[PDB]
Amino acid sequence: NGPIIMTREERMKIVHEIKERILDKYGDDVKAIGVYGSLGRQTDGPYSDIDMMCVMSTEEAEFSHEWTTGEWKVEVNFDSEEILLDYASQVESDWPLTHGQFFSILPIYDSGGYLEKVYQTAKSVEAQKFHDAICALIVEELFEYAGKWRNIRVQGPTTFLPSLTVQVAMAGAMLIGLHHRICYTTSASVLTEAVKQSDLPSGYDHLCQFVMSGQLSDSEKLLESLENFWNGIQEWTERHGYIVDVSKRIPF
Amino acid sequence: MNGPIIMTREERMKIVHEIKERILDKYGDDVKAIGVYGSLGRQTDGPYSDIDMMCVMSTEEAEFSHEWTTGEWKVEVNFDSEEILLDYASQVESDWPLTHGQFFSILPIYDSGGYLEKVYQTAKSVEAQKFHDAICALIVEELFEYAGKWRNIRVQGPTTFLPSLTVQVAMAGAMLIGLHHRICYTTSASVLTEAVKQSDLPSGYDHLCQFVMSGQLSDSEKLLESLENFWNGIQEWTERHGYIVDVSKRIPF
Numbered sequence: 001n002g003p004i005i006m007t008r009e010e011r012m013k014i015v016h017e018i019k020e021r022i023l024d025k026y027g028d029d030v031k032a033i034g035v036y037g038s039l040g041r042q043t044d045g046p047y048s049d050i051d052m053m054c055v056m057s058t059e060e061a062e063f064s065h066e067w068t069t070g071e072w073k074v075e076v077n078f079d080s081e082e083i084l085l086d087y088a089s090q091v092e093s094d095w096p097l098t099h100g101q102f103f104s105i106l107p108i109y110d111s112g113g114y115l116e117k118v119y120q121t122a123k124s125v126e127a128q129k130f131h132d133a134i135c136a137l138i139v140e141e142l143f144e145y146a147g148k149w150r151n152i153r154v155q156g157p158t159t160f161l162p163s164l165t166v167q168v169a170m171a172g173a174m175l176i177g178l179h180h181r182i183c184y185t186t187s188a189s190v191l192t193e194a195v196k197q198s199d200l201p202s203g204y205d206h207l208c209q210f211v212m213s214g215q216l217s218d219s220e221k222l223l224e225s226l227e228n229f230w231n232g233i234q235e236w237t238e239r240h241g242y243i244v245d246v247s248k249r250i251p252f
Numbered sequence: 253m254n255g256p257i258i259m260t261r262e263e264r265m266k267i268v269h270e271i272k273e274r275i276l277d278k279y280g281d282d283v284k285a286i287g288v289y290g291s292l293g294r295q296t297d298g299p300y301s302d303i304d305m306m307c308v309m310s311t312e313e314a315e316f317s318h319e320w321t322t323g324e325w326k327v328e329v330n331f332d333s334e335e336i337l338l339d340y341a342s343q344v345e346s347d348w349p350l351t352h353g354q355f356f357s358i359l360p361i362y363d364s365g366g367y368l369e370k371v372y373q374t375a376k377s378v379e380a381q382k383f384h385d386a387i388c389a390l391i392v393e394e395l396f397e398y399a400g401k402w403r404n405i406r407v408q409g410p411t412t413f414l415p416s417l418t419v420q421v422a423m424a425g426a427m428l429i430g431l432h433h434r435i436c437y438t439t440s441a442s443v444l445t446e447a448v449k450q451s452d453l454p455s456g457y458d459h460l461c462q463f464v465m466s467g468q469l470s471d472s473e474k475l476l477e478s479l480e481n482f483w484n485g486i487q488e489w490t491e492r493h494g495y496i497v498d499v500s501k502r503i504p505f
């Protein structure tokens with residue numbers, strides 16, 4: 001019947017059950033256990049799942065247990081300290097979406113401040129990595145998206161335009177999050193938090209109103225809204241020094 | 253940069269061969285093969301399409317990519333050792349229908365020993381069990397969690413996320429059906445349009461896709477009905493096709 005309603009107290013009872021099972025199964029190879037996601041922020045809603053992370057002493061440990069009981073869902077990630085720290089210091093195009101997990105850790109088990117170390121590593125990422133990730137996002141994501149809707153304008157399909165518009169607004173949100181080096185609280189609040197940030201690219205907020213409201217059927221408006229956002233991107237990047245290399249026809 | 257410019261297939265192929273020559277010049281006999289994938293590999297590139305190319309290296313553990321723009325056009329070249337590429341071609345993730353069409357239409361431009369054919373043969377020869385597992389994982393990892401997200405939206409918001417979530421659910425359903433039929437979608441723009449003409453869809457999916465394809469995503473009440481109907485169709489569909497996971501234990505490890 002899909003996920004059921006659960007209270008915060010029931011989810012924490014489940015968490016401590018998982019904690020005991022982890023400690024029983026892996027014992028002294030467990031360095032730390034934490035809850036992240038909305039339960040880690042103590043903002044989980046009725047239908048929220050449980051996300052837990054485990055620091056293992058075993059070197060090269062990298063596995064996950066993800067399951068449902070038919071009523072609720074749990075995900076537990078098991079990483080060696082090195083693998084977890086290296087992932088926490090790595091900045092992809094979706095870093096604002098993903099790395100909020102290291103800012104929300106509720107420690108449940110910790111033998112030596114490992115969860116604090118993970119948090120310190122995530123909040124201390126060098127500014128250059130956000131610069132590089134922003135330039136990568138423009139090339140690998142926004143430029144490709146611009147080709148996709150320009151193709152749609154000349155040859156369709158307009159049936160893809162609503163989905164693409166959603167993706168573009170999300171990519172724009174990642175761009176803003178990388179620029180402010182702030183992680184969004186949750187996925188559902190990515191767009192609502194993005195448009196309250198300072199320093200938006202021209203045309204971004206207008207595009208987001210289509211995605212947030214769901215009024216994505218006027219495909220001519222959407223293409224014009226995408227173009228204005230794309231135009232504002234070049235002005236915004238030049239104004240913030242996120243300059244993309246266009247000088248080499250073949251850069252290797 | 254003025255964004256992507258109009259380019260013809262002839263111009264894009266001229267660019268491909270310039271890249272091939274530079275790859276062959278730089279890596280010499282460590283290049284086992286070079287091929288084109290994406291819409292240019294299918295010779296269906298549109299005016300604003302970019303260029304996607306693959307390269308098989310003999311160097312062990314080679315795994316890098318060069319992706320760049322000139323301000324007018326964009327290129328991506330992926331370099332993989334044969335082993336890494338054959339391994340990647342034979343793993344089935346939740347997004348296999350989105351990603352692995354690349355191995356079925358490679359336009360060959362350089363090949364020292366049928367490596368491009370070997371990649372294709374590897375991609376088509378994946379065991380049925382790998383699709384079964386990917387489908388069961390997808391239900392747990394993606395659909396069940398999406399169901400909680402829209403149920404959370406109904407009770408505590410935000411509805412401003414609902415159009416986006418609905419797009420994501422339609423895409424995941426498209427992966428689900430593509431995994432079921434072992435069909436890879438052509439390009440991202442055709443994922444939903446091809447998913448809905450597949451036989452034996454879960455009940456409520458085509459209606460959900462009609463919301464997403466038409467862009468009529470402002471009626472939060474109707475979307476929530478539609479997501480629930482599709483979620484119901486999933487329970488019927490998986491359970492009728494044997495995509496069953498044991499869910500009886502509170503902690504299954």
Ligand SMILES: NC[C@@H]1O[C@H](O[C@H]2[C@@H](O)[C@H](O[C@@H]3[C@@H](O)[C@H](N)C[C@H](N)[C@H]3O[C@H]3O[C@H](CN)[C@@H](O)[C@H](O)[C@H]3N)O[C@@H]2CO)[C@H](N)[C@@H](O)[C@@H]1O
Nearest residue numbers: 093140144290304315319328330331332336337340351354
């Ligand atoms: N190449 C074979 C294998 O690919 C894997 O990565 C796969 C996937 O992650 C990766 O996706 C990469 C991302 O990462 C990176 N952040 C930007 C890049 N444009 C995107 O590329 C892919 O998605 C784009 C659509 N948005 C497509 O336009 C593009 O043609 C496609 N190669 O491309 C690969 C599939 O083509 C691993 N590298 C490795 O297991 C092995 O190399």
Ligand SMILES: NC[C@@H]1O[C@H](O[C@H]2[C@@H](O)[C@H](O[C@@H]3[C@@H](O)[C@H](N)C[C@H](N)[C@H]3O[C@H]3O[C@H](CN)[C@@H](O)[C@H](O)[C@H]3N)O[C@@H]2CO)[C@H](N)[C@@H](O)[C@@H]1O
Nearest residue numbers: 037051062063066075077079083084087098101393394397
């Ligand atoms: N965990 C530390 C690091 O995680 C990485 O993977 C990251 C990412 O791909 C991975 O994503 C995994 C997927 O893969 C897997 N196929 C389904 C699973 N629901 C999803 O989980 C992630 O996405 C969900 C939202 N859709 C979130 O609810 C979930 O909490 C989040 N961990 O979770 C990790 C981030 O939390 C690498 N494994 C490795 O660098 C190292 O293990």
Ligand SMILES: Nc1ncnc2c1ncn2[C@@H]1O[C@H](COP(=O)(O)CP(=O)(O)OP(=O)(O)O)[C@@H](O)[C@H]1O
Nearest residue numbers: 037038039044045048049051097098099100101186
């Ligand atoms: N695609 C993704 N990949 C990796 N991490 C992600 C992710 N999406 C979200 N996250 C990270 O993983 C955490 C848990 O994500 P989710 O379970 O999907 C939503 P949540 O933040 O717990 O709020 P919720 O109550 O709506 O569930 C996020 O808070 C975020 O830090």
Ligand SMILES: Nc1ncnc2c1ncn2[C@@H]1O[C@H](COP(=O)(O)CP(=O)(O)OP(=O)(O)O)[C@@H](O)[C@H]1O
Nearest residue numbers: 290291297298301302304350351353354438439440
């Ligand atoms: N998110 C993704 N990740 C990995 N591969 C993807 C992908 N999306 C699409 N693909 C694969 O990579 C190839 C190239 O994708 P893209 O360049 O993004 C669109 P295309 O198929 O070339 O048509 P188009 O560029 O004319 O719109 C696709 O044909 C497809 O097999």
Ligand SMILES: [Ca+2]
Nearest residue numbers: 037038049051
């Ligand atoms: Ca969660």
Ligand SMILES: [Ca+2]
Nearest residue numbers: 049050051075
């Ligand atoms: Ca989760």
Ligand SMILES: [Ca+2]
Nearest residue numbers: 290291302304
């Ligand atoms: Ca392409």
Ligand SMILES: [Ca+2]
Nearest residue numbers: 144302304328
């Ligand atoms: Ca591409």
